[PDB]
Amino acid sequence: IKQGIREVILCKDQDGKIGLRLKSIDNGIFVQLVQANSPASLVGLRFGDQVLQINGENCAGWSSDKAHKVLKQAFGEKITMTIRDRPFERTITMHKDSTGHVGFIFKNGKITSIVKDSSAARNGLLTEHNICEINGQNVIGLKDSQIADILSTSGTVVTITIMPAFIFEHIIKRMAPSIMKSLMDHTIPEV
């Protein structure tokens, strides 16, 4: 989680798509979904990112509907965006024990308990938090078992990006869960 504001230059695909849905939150604009193999995925936009500006204009107070209208109406040539990195999320680094455990229980991607004397415990992992990413990869809408598989396949150092559930639940509202399983980019970034 960069304390940066960074700028991204986007470019519509063949079909005039950038692969993004935006949500209005406390009078700002936040990324609800990034589609796999989209311009938004390629420039590195992430679930939870705040869009401060689109083409130099301020997003504050905008509705979701208006943000979407703006993206459409613009010339796909270059859409410039001003992005605050994942402001509602934090990252926790954990280390796996000898049994390959970090030390929590989660249900539906939400952490619900912290195992005593775990690394999760030592690092102050919190419950009532939705997991958004593991080791920099988005896991939102994946099954509980597949999140377990990513933690397994992970090397000892486990990095988890987490969001307060009340905030997470506000962001995903009005998005059919299949879209999240099927469309939300769940890939490691390209170099």
Curated annotation (Swiss-Prot):
Induction: By IFNG/IFN-gamma in melanoma cells. Expressed in lung cancers, including adenocarcinoma, squamous cell carcinoma and small-cell carcinoma (at protein level). Widely expressed. Expressed in fetal kidney, liver, lung and brain. In adult highest expression in heart and placenta. Its main location: other. The keyword Membrane applies. GO terms for cellular component: adherens junction; azurophil granule lumen; blood microparticle; cytoplasm; cytoskeleton; cytosol; endoplasmic reticulum membrane; extracellular exosome. It is found in: Cell junction, Focal adhesion; Cell junction, Adherens junction; Cell membrane; Endoplasmic reticulum membrane. Phosphorylated on tyrosine residues. GO terms for biological process: actin cytoskeleton organization; chemical synaptic transmission; intracellular signal transduction; negative regulation of receptor internalization; negative regulation of transcription by RNA polymerase II; positive regulation of cell growth; positive regulation of cell migration; positive regulation of cell population proliferation. Multifunctional adapter protein involved in diverse array of functions including trafficking of transmembrane proteins, neuro and immunomodulation, exosome biogenesis, and tumorigenesis. Positively regulates TGFB1-mediated SMAD2/3 activation and TGFB1-induced epithelial-to-mesenchymal transition (EMT) and cell migration in various cell types. May increase TGFB1 signaling by enhancing cell-surface expression of TGFR1 by preventing the interaction between TGFR1 and CAV1 and subsequent CAV1-dependent internalization and degradation of TGFR1. This is Syntenin-1. It comes from Homo sapiens (Human).
